[PDB]
Amino acid sequence: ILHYEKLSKIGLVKGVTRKYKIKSNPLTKDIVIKMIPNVSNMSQCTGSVMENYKTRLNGILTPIKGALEIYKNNTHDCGVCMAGVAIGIATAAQITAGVALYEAMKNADNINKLKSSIESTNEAVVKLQETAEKTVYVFTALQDYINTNLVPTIDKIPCKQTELSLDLALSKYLSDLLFVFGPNLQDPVSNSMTIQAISQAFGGNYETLLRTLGYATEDFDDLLESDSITGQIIYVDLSSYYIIVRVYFPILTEIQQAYIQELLPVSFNNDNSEWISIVPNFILVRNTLISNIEIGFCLITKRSVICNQDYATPMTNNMRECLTGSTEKCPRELVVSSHVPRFALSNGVLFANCISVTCQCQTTGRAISQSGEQTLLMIDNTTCPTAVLGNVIISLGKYLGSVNYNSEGIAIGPPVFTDKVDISSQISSMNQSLQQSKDYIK
Amino acid sequence: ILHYEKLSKIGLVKGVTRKYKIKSNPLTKDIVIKMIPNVSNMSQCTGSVMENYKTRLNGILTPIKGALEIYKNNTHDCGVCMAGVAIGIATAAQITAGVALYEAMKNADNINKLKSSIESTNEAVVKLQETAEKTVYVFTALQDYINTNLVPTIDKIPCKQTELSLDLALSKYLSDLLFVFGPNLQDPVSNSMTIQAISQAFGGNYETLLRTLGYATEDFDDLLESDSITGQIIYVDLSSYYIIVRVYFPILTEIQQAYIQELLPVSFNNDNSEWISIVPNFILVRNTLISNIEIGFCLITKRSVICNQDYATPMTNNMRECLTGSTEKCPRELVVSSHVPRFALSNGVLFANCISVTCQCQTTGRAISQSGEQTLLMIDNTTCPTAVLGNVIISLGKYLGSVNYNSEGIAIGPPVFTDKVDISSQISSMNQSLQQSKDYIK
Amino acid sequence: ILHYEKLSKIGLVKGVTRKYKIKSNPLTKDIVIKMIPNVSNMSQCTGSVMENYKTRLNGILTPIKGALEIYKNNTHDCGVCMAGVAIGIATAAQITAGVALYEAMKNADNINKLKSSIESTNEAVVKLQETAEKTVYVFTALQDYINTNLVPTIDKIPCKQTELSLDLALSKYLSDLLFVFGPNLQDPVSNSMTIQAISQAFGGNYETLLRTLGYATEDFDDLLESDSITGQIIYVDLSSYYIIVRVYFPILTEIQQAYIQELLPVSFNNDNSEWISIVPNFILVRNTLISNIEIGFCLITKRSVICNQDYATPMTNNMRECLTGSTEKCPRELVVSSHVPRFALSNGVLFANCISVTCQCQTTGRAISQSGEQTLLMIDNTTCPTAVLGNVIISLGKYLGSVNYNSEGIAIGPPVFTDKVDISSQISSMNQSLQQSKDYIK
Amino acid sequence: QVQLKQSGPGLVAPSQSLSITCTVSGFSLTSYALSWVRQPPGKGLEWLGVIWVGGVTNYNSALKSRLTISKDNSKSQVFLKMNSLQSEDTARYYCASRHLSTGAMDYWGQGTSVTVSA
Amino acid sequence: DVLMTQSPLSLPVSLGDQASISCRSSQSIVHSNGDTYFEWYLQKPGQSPKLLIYKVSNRFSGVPNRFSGSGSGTDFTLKISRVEAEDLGVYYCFQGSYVPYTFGGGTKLEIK
Ligand SMILES: *[C@@H]1O[C@H](CO)[C@@H](O[C@@H]2O[C@H](CO)[C@@H](O[C@@H]3O[C@H](CO)[C@@H](O)[C@H](O)[C@H]3NC(C)=O)[C@H](O)[C@H]2NC(C)=O)[C@H](O)[C@H]1NC(C)=O
Ligand SMILES: *[C@@H]1O[C@H](CO)[C@@H](O)[C@H](O)[C@H]1NC(C)=O
Ligand SMILES: *[C@@H]1O[C@H](CO)[C@@H](O)[C@H](O)[C@H]1NC(C)=O
Ligand SMILES: *[C@@H]1O[C@H](CO)[C@@H](O)[C@H](O)[C@H]1NC(C)=O
Ligand SMILES: *[C@@H]1O[C@H](CO)[C@@H](O)[C@H](O)[C@H]1NC(C)=O
Ligand SMILES: *[C@@H]1O[C@H](CO)[C@@H](O)[C@H](O)[C@H]1NC(C)=O
Ligand SMILES: *[C@@H]1O[C@H](CO)[C@@H](O)[C@H](O)[C@H]1NC(C)=O
Ligand SMILES: *[C@@H]1O[C@H](CO)[C@@H](O)[C@H](O)[C@H]1NC(C)=O
Ligand SMILES: *[C@@H]1O[C@H](CO)[C@@H](O)[C@H](O)[C@H]1NC(C)=O
Ligand SMILES: *[C@@H]1O[C@H](CO)[C@@H](O)[C@H](O)[C@H]1NC(C)=O
Ligand SMILES: *[C@@H]1O[C@H](CO)[C@@H](O)[C@H](O)[C@H]1NC(C)=O
Ligand SMILES: *[C@@H]1O[C@H](CO)[C@@H](O)[C@H](O)[C@H]1NC(C)=O
């Protein structure tokens, strides 16, 4: 129930309306990533780099297995059954992730029966038939590079240089990998890890993983760029150096009787000065309730806002009174920079601050003037069929509000200062004045 | 008119003075980027990957053309003429960038006449020219990889491994596009997109793009690192899979009678503890006004600050007063950590907190003592030619100022807490105290 | 000490306790990085790309040497002796870095006597040792790619394409390098630059550098991920295009009588609504003093918190009183989103908000009910040996606190709003109400 | 190298049971699936069934559920068991190994001739 | 089930000519994972069948270049560029996508 007519005079021109939708109902698939390549067809002079690489990988991967083994040891069937005394400290999300891990262990056990076949894979991407209808997907790191560069040139170069090149490739892979799977991975028991982060074990190529799994949907890009596709590590093998990851594919469901409204800020004039209004630019209206939205964590689209979680945020009563037509409770800030917007377009109607920018009507050839008692001017074709704003000429529509828009004034809010350091200064000044009144009262 | 004399006793030692300059007056050039490579010399082993790649790329590129097409239809001559009713909702930046899109359509028409010549290119960088009027460079992605890696090893590797290697390269290239050209690109009409972001369509090699087009100077790296070199997409081809980009090269102009002053914070002793002053570190001083600057989006150089936009922000009167001499209005914060600075040097004279560190003369061997009534000590060569502050021995200059610096005290401001959570606690405490005062005064 | 019993009723379930350790006592090692590859075995048709590359690299590297020469000229032995008047303006950290730069010149001079051997290197990693006096390691920026790709394909490819490939690779290297060594590097004197940033001169392969230089232990990876391994540039050569870097290897020392305590937030019931408490989640407790910590700059592990610097920050008296038992001073915020946690587990004991989630006992089959006057319920095996919360069944331990936990109420603090825009509105409302009280008494 | 060996009785009286054992060498049954194929004297090849790595088996639907296949990883042997043999079942039986990837029967045994008559 | 039809039944061809054998399925044999398991087998008289083309267009190790496989959808063809004496035998098309797996009818190569 926003009052757009009053909000427009303080330079809050309404924008487009968007829908609100959140992910739900995920489907699951399992993939296998092998973190060590196969060097059989070039093994004659690989040197001792592979033993050192295995030594590094074992130390990298041991803490993950150690953390996974906590929930695996203490989960049984009493239908998922847990022992709270042994776990000790946990959160709700971690408990749910442990339940999901227990459920995924059933398929992990079947996948683990093909360990010999997994060890012998010699291609970047392979598919193994576990059954007539079931397939296992295996992805190997640095296999393509070896097969395409090192094997072909094994005879044209002394393989001391080949050993050096293999060592550099392995070290670069480890350097890229450490940013995600290192000590930063404090809690592997969770499903908030995105597929893009996991794909760093495959050189950052999540497109290959997604197209090999065969996920094809209209909202694929929207789900991908909103961090809605996530994965979970369910098994770590310290002998063959491979991991099993379950991937979740949710769908987007639209919340009914909910939408997000945008406001375009425009500077306005008051007492020979230029001001802007300090109000939220995105408002989440759900049923009839007005609240804030953490729009920075979501994905904005032409006609929708996609989030992986509900980001509703409470709103003060004074701001709610502001948004419903009480313009005297809306704070404003002074403008000292030369780079701020001075006009905007809404439904073919032009809202401009014709004091800071020259306005002219092409049909009559005479300028458009703004009085000192007005904040903005509403320009439509009832007074100017086409207007010139500097280097642009635009034809205008008709306003659907009050006929007397340019003759009705409104009340104005109090000035503010939103700088971080100014916030600390304003608190001190108020507190000192508060103590002065306290002593004078006493 | 900052009062450095009083500011130094609070620990705000003045630093270097810098100039202020902003970009202006851009020049324009047009380039063509092909987003699909030429695989004619390896067509015998391409399989069916190219059709899938084309299908994915068309779906990626369709929204960009759909968004650009809105302004194409509703802009005409009548000196650039637009229909406001058909556009509906637009900001001032979009309309301004919609004029520039129409202006570039004259050059894009001549480039599109070479559609056949563009598609037959088989090098990473080529120059196409029929007359002096049409001199355009074409950049092809992944062309170097095919020409140098896949083609030479065509006959010593299975025809299938070559096909899989091509598939992985296209997917890896496509995984980097989505971060820039995916659904995040809601508004392609703007011209604020930097050249580094655009270069992701060419594998992130923006050095090749700029070197081919023009020159490099001292201001070249300043314009590049300040994000002052931008580009705009002016044409998208959904059959030949290429785009035309206009690159803007501005110049740096410095603002007259404007400079930015830096202050070096030093901790000081008040009663039995160390304190720091909560004031802005960078002060922008135009003709006469004093105001803050959002220097986070500004390139800091030893001689000047290069902001691509005007980033001046307002300042409170109390903070403006403290900086001019009213020291009692300066907020301070308690020091609890042990890694704060204790001394600084300016114009050859150093200001040190001799309580927290060892102060001693290297000429006479006698220690330098600070009493409880002093916040800092000023040490020049009229007091001691050489001073030692631990492992460093430094020779001092002469102070240009009051001879009685160490004998004159000052009055300091109130303590503050700047933690994010502590702000909410302080607001609540004042509000409840404010309510209590209203109850009694009734 | 904190009063955990009341904080649990407020909704702050205690978590795990971690130790506090900070970087100290570093060792030093020197390396050489060559920033230009050796093209002797392909020089017959390299074209003129190398001259242009040298011209670009010289202009990139000149400012670094210019900044270094400021301290080189004015530091001498008179045990490190500096001229304050000539330096002019500096900070304590910069002066310490200058002392270190002076101390590194003894080894820099010895390394510089192997210049002719340095240009003659033709491998990615070369160990140079004339005698026991000089045993430096040399890393070449782009030698591996040359040796493995460009040399073997001289005869097969028209080497105009080889020139194009070399130029493109050099341009890509410069593009990746400019992000770190460009005009962003205003102060190369300091030693706070991590080895990950330095490795960009070697293509981002810091793993090779660290593995070649020395060893790895339990604390090695924790030091690496906490940004405790840094480097400093001590020499720049503009005729041979290489730099000398000193790398620091510190150790971790735990702080005695210090630990970090974690609190798990759980929503609670008041009136007919849902609330969460706005308090710090990590509490740093030194000998007997409670304070905050900027834990976003530190590394968090299972049993320790690792920082490269002391990040303690002050705390208000009201928050300290909140943490020590007075719950009436703890602010709370409304819950509008549906994704905040409802329960948590601590020491085998379950704290849950059973108004919003269905609690029930698996032993007796009866539901667990919460009255309107209880914020939370503590569930242990004296009342319910096994509880069911949706899809999880968990066995519970025994509570060590008061037996009458569920029959005793607490006082509740004032509501708050933590939105950034709401902060400005609350300051305005408080100030206007304050002014009326000042006018009322006048 | 890899090679396959069959063994069997050869002559089977009508309405009795048939047992054929195929012994593998050179590769392990933990990394290959095994298929059984029979060929009538004047007809083409016919598919009987396959046993996967995990022990799951699939059979030809037209064989009236008279087939069962089992394997022994420890002895590296796979057994084919058939009951209610009749005159139509006279054929040459092969055991072939199916690759986990590319799904091809790349190795074949020498075959065993089975005749059902009085 | 998937019925496999192979024609011609007999292919009388002289030495050095081109041979083309076509096998057709009653329905699409693309597996749920995207692959198409289709093979060609050659059986010499008195010998076990051997593998020639282990996928639609993938040639097995040790197979001469004279054999080339192609096809899509429900039509698959095998082409022999230069018919030789050793190529005489019976050719079977085998599908391995949907249970039960079925063999082709078999094409008998004959010297004209
Ligand atoms: C280790 O890898 C090597 C490289 O892949 C394998 O060597 C084989 O060498 C053959 C001889 O050149 C290649 O045949 C060529 O294949 C291409 C593409 O199919 C054809 O265009 C060429 O005409 C053909 N060469 C000739 C003379 O006809 C093989 O492609 C190549 N790879 C394979 C898998 O055979 C080694 O065999 C491999 N080592 C082992 C033990 O497998
Ligand atoms: C889990 O159980 C295994 C097997 O008994 C044991 O080796 C491991 O230490 C256990 N881990 C934990 C965290 O209890
Ligand atoms: C003004 O614009 C509206 C479009 O909303 C149009 O219907 C109307 O005819 C216009 N009036 C004039 C006088 O141009
Ligand atoms: C409060 O309002 C008065 C005007 O009555 C103004 O002078 C003062 O600066 C304001 N203070 C704050 C902290 O907003
Ligand atoms: C590559 O293509 C060119 C023509 O564009 C041709 O002359 C050349 O022979 C080709 N090279 C190879 C290796 O096919
Ligand atoms: C623009 O015009 C073209 C052709 O006239 C038409 O196909 C397209 O739908 C129009 N788009 C818009 C947004 O008007
Ligand atoms: C102190 O330093 C100044 C330089 O600022 C120098 O001119 C002077 O000679 C020095 N000595 C004395 C006693 O002033
Ligand atoms: C206000 O000042 C008093 C002393 O006058 C002090 O005790 C109190 O903590 C201060 N409060 C705030 C929020 O600054
Ligand atoms: C590089 O050049 C030297 C100089 O003659 C030569 O001895 C060496 O063999 C060359 N290296 C290669 C890989 O050709
Ligand atoms: C340092 O001294 C050298 C040699 O006298 C001179 O060329 C250079 O300009 C000096 N640099 C500075 C910053 O004074
Ligand atoms: C409750 O848990 C404690 C350990 O916390 C245990 O000693 C006690 O036996 C348990 N009681 C029941 C009835 O399970
Ligand atoms: C102050 O308290 C009153 C009543 O206690 C409340 O209405 C008002 O919203 C509060 N304001 C702030 C800024 O906390």
Q: What is the 3-state secondary structure (H, E, C) of C219-234?
A: HHHHHHHCCCCEEEEE
- CA–CA gap between residue A201 and residue A240 (Å, rounded): 15
Which chain C positions have a beta carbon within 8 Å of B205's beta carbon?
168, 171-172, 175
- With H, G, I as helix, E, B as strand and everything else as coil, classify residue B356: coil
Pocket of ligand 4 (CB under 6 A): A 426, 429-430; C 431, 435
**Would you call the peptide bond into E100 cis, given omega within 30 degrees of 0 as the criterion?**
yes
Mutate which of A398, A400, A403 for ligand 3? The one with the most ligand atoms within 8 Å of its CB, which is A398
What distances in angstroms separate CA A282 from CA A266, A305, B89, C265, one per listed residue? 15, 11, 16, 28
Rounded Cα distance between C175 and C173, Å, is: 5
User: What stretches of B175-321 adopt beta strand conformation (E)?
Assistant: 193-194, 230-237, 242-265, 268-269, 274-277, 282-285, 290-293, 299-300, 304-307, 312-313
* Residue of A287, A308, A311, A313 to mutate, testing the C interface (most C Cβ within 10 Å of its Cβ): A313
Ligand 9 nearest-atom number relative to CA A157: 13
**What single DSSP character describes residue C100?**
H
The answer to whether A427 contacts C427, with C-beta atoms less than 8 Å apart, is yes
Chain D: closest CA distance from residue E81 (Å): 24
Q: Residue C218 is inside which H or E element, if any?
A: helix C218-225
A216 touches chain E (CB under 8 A): no
Partner residues linked to B269 by β-bridges: B274
Q: Which three-class secondary structure state does DSSP give residue B266? A: coil
Q: Is D67 on the interface with E (CB under 8 A)?
A: no
Count CB neighbours of B229 within 10 A: 23
Answer for the pair C323, C290: CB distance below 8 angstroms, yes or no. yes
d(CA C59, CA B373): 52
End-to-end alpha carbon distance in chain B? 46
Distance between start and end Cα atoms, chain E: 36
Which tokens sit at A27?
A: 């489907």
Beta-bridge mates of residue B193: B231
Residues of B in contact with A431 (CB under 8 A): 414, 426, 430
Stretch (H or E) spanning B18: strand B12-34
Nearest to C64 by CA among C199, C184, C175: C184
Task: State how far the Cα of B144 lies from the Cα of C226, in Å rounded to an integer.
Answer: 39
One DSSP character per residue, A340-394 reads S--EEEETTEEEE-TTTS-EEETTT--EE---TT-S-EEE-TTT-SEEEETTEEE
Q: HEC states along A90-123?
A: EEHHHHHHHHHHHHHHHHHHHHHHHHHHHHCCCC
Question: Residue with the nearest Cα to atom 13 of ligand 11?
Answer: C381
- The contacts found for A403-412 with CB under 8 angstroms, 24 or more apart, are A405/A5, A405/A378, A406/A374, A406/A377, A406/A378, A409/A9, A409/A373, A409/A374, A410/A6, A410/A9, A410/A10, A410/A327, A410/A375, A411/A327, A411/A328, A412/A10, A412/A270, A412/A327, A412/A328, A412/A332
Residue nearest atom 6 in ligand 9 by C-alpha distance: C41
Assign 3-class secondary structure to chain E.
CCCEEEECCEEEECCCCCEEEEEEECCCCCCCCCCCCEEEEEECCCCCCEEEECCCCCECCCCCCCEEEEEECCEEEEEECCCCCCCCCEEEEEECCCCCCEECCCEEEEEC
Contact A335, A276 (CB under 8 A): yes
Q: Kindly state the DSSP code that residue B297 receives in the 8-state scheme.
A: G
| E103/D111 touch (CB, cutoff 8 Å), yes or no | no
Q: Which two structure tokens, joined as six digits, stand for B68?
A: 């650009």
- How far apart CA A427 and CA B430 sit, in angstroms, is 9
Asked if E34 lies within 8 A of A214 by C-beta distance, the reply is yes
Structure tokens at A134: 């079931």
Atom of ligand 5 nearest to the CA of B151: 13
Tell me how far apart the alpha carbons of residues A20 and A306 are, in angstroms, rounded to a whole number: 7
CA of B158 from ligand 1 middle (Å) equals 6
Q: Which of C377, C368, C361, C350 is nearest to C264 (CA)?
A: C350
Quick check: A123 and B164 CB within 8 A?
A: yes
Report whether B110 contacts B126 (CB < 8 A).
no
∠ Cα B96 B101 B107 (to 5°): 145
Ligand 8 proximal residues by C-beta, below 6 Å: A 431, 435; B 426, 429-430
| C46 residue type, one letter | T
CA gap A163, A47 in Å, rounded: 7
How far is residue A226 from each of residues A22, A253, A258, C234, measured CA to CA in Å? 10, 14, 19, 45
Q: Do B233 and B256 meet the contact criterion of CB atoms below 8 Å apart?
A: no
Quote the CA–CA distance of B425 and B423 in Å, as a whole number. Answer: 5
Closest alpha carbon to B242 in B148, B140, B339: B140
- Report yes or no: A219 and A253 within 8 Å, Cβ to Cβ: no
| Residue with token string 């093909």 | A114
- Shortest CA distance to B6 belongs to which of B383, B379, B396, B378? B378
Flag whether E touches D (3+ CB pairs, 8 A cutoff): yes
Residues of E in contact with A135 (CB under 8 A): 32-33
Q: Hey, which bits of C340-402 come out as E strands?
A: 343-346, 349-352, 359-361, 367-368, 377-379, 386-389, 392-395
C41 C-alpha to ligand 9 centroid (Å): 6
- Residue D101 touches partner E, C-beta closer than 8 Å: no
> Is A401 close to ligand 3, i.e. is its CB under 6 Å away?
no
Q: Is the CB of C430 under 6 A from ligand 12?
A: yes
DSSP string covering A172-221: HHHHHHHHHHSTT----S-S-EEHHHHGGGGTT-HHHHHHHHT---TTHH
Show the tokens assigned to B103. 């202006």
Instruction: Report CB contact under 8 Å: C207, A414.
Output: no
- Helix (H/G/I), strand (E/B), else coil: D49: strand
Phi, psi for residue D43 in degrees, rounded to 5: -125, 180
Give the C-alpha distances (Å, rounded to integers) separating A382 from A400, B84, B88.
11, 14, 17
Residues touching ligand 7 (Cβ under 6 Å) are B 348, 381-382, 397-398; C 85
Strands (E), C149-207: 193-194
Beta strands in C120-241 (DSSP E): 125-127, 137-140, 193-194, 230-237
Centre of ligand 1 to C-alpha A237, Å, is 33
**Which of B265, B282, B299 is closest to B17 using CA atoms?**
B282
CA angle C262, C265, C269 (to 5 degrees): 150
Cβ contacts of E46 within 8 Å, gap of 6 or more: none
CA C157 to ligand 5 center in whole angstroms: 10
**Calpha distance B376→E111 (Å, rounded):** 110
Give C166 Cα–ligand 2 centroid separation in angstroms.
54
A303 Cα distance to chain centroid: 17
The answer to whether the Cβ–Cβ distance between A133 and E35 falls below 8 Å is no
CA distances to A19, A227, A259, A299, C262 from A255, in Å = 8, 19, 8, 16, 36
Method: cryo-EM
Output the ligand 9 site: residues, CB below 6 A.
C 40-41, 151
The CA C397 to ligand 11 mean position distance, Å, reads 6
Can you tell me the distance from the alpha carbon of D22 to that of D19, in angstroms, rounded to the nearest whole number? 10
The total number of residues written for chain D in this structure: 118
Instruction: Name which of C155, C138, C131 is nearest C209 in CA terms.
Output: C138
Interfacial E residues in 3-42 facing D (CB < 8 Å): 35, 37, 39, 41
Which secondary-structure segment (H or E) carries A128? strand A125-129
C-alpha A305/C-alpha A22 separation (Å) is 9
Nearest beta carbon to residue C148 from set A161, A430, A441: A161
Give SS3 for C71.
Answer: helix
In a 3-state reduction of DSSP, which class is residue D113?
Answer: strand
Task: Give the whole-angstrom CA distance, residue D92 versus residue D114.
Answer: 6
Chain centre to alpha carbon of residue B295: 9
Of B44, B156, B160, B161, best ligand 1 pocket probe by most atoms within 8 Å of the beta carbon: B156
Cis amide linkage into residue A183, ω under 30° from 0: no
* Beta-sheet strands, E only, within B289-374: 290-293, 299-300, 304-307, 312-313, 332-334, 343-346, 349-352, 360-361
Secondary structure of residue C397 in the 3-state scheme? coil
Q: How many residue contacts between D and E have a Cβ separation below 8 Å?
A: 55
What single DSSP character describes residue C259?
A: E
Task: Give the Cα separation of D83 and D64 in Å (integer).
Answer: 11
Q: Which listed ligand is nearest to A68 at the C-alpha? A: 2
* C-beta B86 within 6 A of ligand 6: no
Distance, CA of C269 to CA of C251 (rounded, Å): 47
Chain C, 121 to 180: residues with Cβ < 8 Å from chain B are 149, 153, 156-157, 161-162, 164-165, 167-168, 171-172, 174-176, 178
Nearest-angstrom CA–CA distance, B298 and B292? 13
* Angstroms from E90 CA to nearest CA on chain A: 28
Pick the closest to residue B32 from B119, B160, B144, B148 (CA basis). B119
How many beta-carbon pairs below 8 A join chains A and E? Answer: 8
Interstrand relation of C12-34 and C304-307 (parallel, antiparallel or unpaired): parallel
CA dist B419 and B437 (Å) reads 27
CA–CA separation, C317 and B422 (whole Å):
10
Residues in C touching A279 (Cβ below 8 Å): 421
Residues in chain B whose C lies over 2.5 Å from the next residue's N (breaks after): 78
The binding-site residues of ligand 10, defined as CB within 6 angstroms of any ligand atom, are C 69-70, 73
How far does residue C324's CA lie from ligand 11's centre (Å)?
Answer: 30
Question: Does residue E65 sit at the A interface (CB-CB below 8 Å)?
Answer: no
For residues A355 and A368, give the distance between their C-alpha atoms in angstroms, rounded to a whole number. 9
Cβ-contact C352, C377 below 8 angstroms: yes
- Is A435 in a helix, a strand, or coil? helix
What burial class does residue B434 get, using C-beta atoms within 10 Å of its C-beta: 0-12 exposed, 13-18 middle, 19+ buried?
middle
Tokens of A270: 């008051």
Residues near B133 by Cβ (< 8 Å), separated by ≥ 6? Answer: B110
Using CA atoms, how far apart are residues B279 and B263, in angstroms rounded to an integer?
9
E49 and D45 within 8 Å at the Cβ level: the answer is yes
Task: Tell me whether B185 touches chain A (CB under 8 Å).
Answer: no
Buried b or exposed e, range B44-55, using 16+ CB within 10 angstroms: ebbeebbeebee
Give chain A positions within 8 Å (CB) of B296: none
What residues of chain B lie within 8 A of the CB of C418, using their CB? 424
CA nearest C336: which of E2, A286, B329? A286
Distances (CA, A) of C341 to A177, C266, C335, D71: 32, 6, 11, 52
CA distance C440 to D75: 101
Residue C37 Cα to ligand 9 middle (Å): 15
**Dihedral through CA B397, CA B400, CA B403, CA B409, nearest 10?**
-100
**B1-26 burial: b if 16+ Cβ within 10 Å, else e:** ebeeebbbbbbbbbbeebebbbbeee
CA distance C136 to C147: 23
CB B186 within 8 A of CB A18: no
